[PDB]
Amino acid sequence: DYKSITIATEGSYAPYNFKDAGGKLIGFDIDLGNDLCKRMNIECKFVEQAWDGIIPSLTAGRYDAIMAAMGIQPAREKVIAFSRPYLLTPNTFLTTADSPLLKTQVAIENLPLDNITPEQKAELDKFTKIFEGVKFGVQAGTSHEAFMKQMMPSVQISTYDTIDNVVMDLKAGRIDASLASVSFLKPLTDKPDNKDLKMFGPRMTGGLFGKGVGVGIRKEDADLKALFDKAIDAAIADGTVQKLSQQWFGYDASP
Ligand SMILES: C[C@@H](N[C@@H](CCCNC(=N)N)C(=O)O)C(=O)O
Numbered sequence: 550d551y552k553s554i555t556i557a558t559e560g561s562y563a564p565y566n567f568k569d570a571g572g573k574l575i576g577f578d579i580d581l582g583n584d585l586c587k588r589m590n591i592e593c594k595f596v597e598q599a600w601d602g603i604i605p606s607l608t609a610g611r612y613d614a615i616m617a618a619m620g621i622q623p624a625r626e627k628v629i630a631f632s633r634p635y636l637l638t639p640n641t642f643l644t645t646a647d648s649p650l651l652k653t654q655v656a657i658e659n660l661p662l663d664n665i666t667p668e669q670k671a672e673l674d675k676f677t678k679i680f681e682g683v684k685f686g687v688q689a690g691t692s693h694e695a696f697m698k699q700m701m702p703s704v705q706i707s708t709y710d711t712i713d714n715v716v717m718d719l720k721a722g723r724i725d726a727s728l729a730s731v732s733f734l735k736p737l738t739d740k741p742d743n744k745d746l747k748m749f750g751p752r753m754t755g756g757l758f759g760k761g762v763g764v765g766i767r768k769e770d771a772d773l774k775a776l777f778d779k780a781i782d783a784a785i786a787d788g789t790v791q792k793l794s795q796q797w798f799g800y801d802a803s804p
Pocket residue numbers: 559560561562566600617618619620621640688690691692693712729730732733762
């Protein structure tokens with residue numbers, strides 16, 4: 550059935566998918582994608598696609614799959630299908646190294662959002678109250694924007710086309726804080742370039758954040774999903790995902 554597939558990626562989300570000095574698409578998603586396709590015995594072709602319109606371009610048949618740090622989110626599951634997750638990561642807050650937000654006590658380090666108890670709601674509510682007067686910046690069309698608008702609506706938020714513009718505005722002092730996964734924030738804050746940026750708050754999973762990072766596939770492409778699932782299961786089992794995770798993120802984020 551399948552001989553060759555076209556995989557779309559954004560190219561603005563390091564270390565998942567970004568551009569090298571020669572403008573070539575590189576990253577965890579590119580390496581994993583190529584490895585998965587070798588296992589599936591199909592030719593792999595990566596294409597650049599802006600995050601805004603990545604989902605409708607898949608459904609319109611511009612390409613066959615999405616590998617762009619995309620979380621398996623319930624709102625996304627309404628429109629497209631996903632492979633089983635190839636990476637699992639919590640989500641946390643970002644600010645500057647001199648921010649008093651860093652002095653905030655974290656009562657729940659690992660906060661699941663699937664069935665929010667009064668205790669867990671009290672923790673979210675504390676941060677919402679601390680975030681009053683704090684300017685947030687997030688990338689548009691993310692689980693982070695959904696979380697902020699639904700869980701912390703009283704918080705002032707600005708949405709950006711790319712995560713690079715968020716980071717730029719945070720370093721420039723135009724925004725006070727952000728929200729993204731640990732898989733994005735840890736390699737960012739590990740860089741000596743960004744020793745003036747720090748992660749803080751609970752490490753949140755589930756709810757609006759979804760079930761992990763997966764390959765976006767059209768709902769009617771059941772055979773392609775089944776092929777990706779087989780390949781992902783094997784890449785996890787043999788330690789390939791762990792290897793690529795350590796190589797790109799500096800830690801093991803494999804399921
Ligand atoms: C793993 C990644 N997932 C987010 C952000 C994805 C942004 N991807 C991109 N710009 N290519 C989401 O699915 O909404 C994150 O939380 O950090």
